[PDB]
Ligand binder design. Structure first.
Ligand SMILES: C[C@]12CCc3c(ccc4cc(O)ccc34)[C@@H]1CCC2=O
Lengths: 124, 124
């Protein structure tokens, strides 16, 4: 089993990598055969190449990312509440999802699902 | 598809029924083939009898439950952050999970998962 300390560390790294625009740092969190379903209900990207391209695209504009509550971490999974903030053509948006990671025995994320809908997207 | 509004309203009803100690009210939100997995990593309870038992056990102590952020809801799924507090023999415990619901086409919950570990529990 993964430790809750390791899984919580991974969540914090993930948030810091997004704030820094650190693409390699984000990708290095995932297993080679991971999948990302973001948002939930959308079609999953799987494998390093699709996931790296997903994140490269998610970084086109500067992001401000905050963890907004403690991480929940048990068995081999973690879930966390956060906000992502960005501005485009002078319009500020704040998206507030809850994401879920499942981790493999080597402590990499094999699965991320990002749960948020239109209700969870707000103005500056 | 379920509307986010209907899922959101169900999360609220769930929370209100736990506060009221209203067992029938909680169990009326689930499909008769629903599963509950709580804690995540434990063995999923399946079907109306096991679901009603899980809840009747939870309700042996009065619970104070409150959502602590907006509900996230999309496709046929919702996730929510909250606290549940209870007290037994002057010892008070506060737990802060993140739960996840999936809903069927009738608008009933077909799966709940409560994600939290020891680090999300505070007893004193
Ligand atoms: C199960 C639960 C989430 C976690 C939880 C509840 C009640 C008592 C608890 C006691 C614990 O030591 C740890 C977790 C819980 C809630 C009752 C309804 C619900 O969703």
């Amino acid at each position: 089993m993964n430790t809750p300390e390791h899984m919580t560390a991974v969540v914090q790294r993930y948030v810091a990598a997004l704030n820094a625009g650190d693409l390699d740092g984000i990708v290095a969190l995932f297993a080679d055969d991971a999948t990302v379903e973001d948002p939930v209900g959308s079609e999953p990207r799987s494998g390093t190449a699709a996931i790296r391209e997903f994140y490269a695209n998610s970084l086109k504009l500067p992001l401000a990312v905050e963890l907004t509550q403690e991480v929940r971490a048990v068995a081999n999974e973690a879930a966390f509440a956060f906000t992502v903030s960005f501005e485009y053509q002078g319009r500020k948006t704040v998206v507030a999802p809850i994401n879920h990671f499942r981790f493999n025995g080597a402590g990499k994320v094999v699965s991320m699902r990002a749960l948020f809908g239109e209700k969870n997207i707000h103005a500056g």
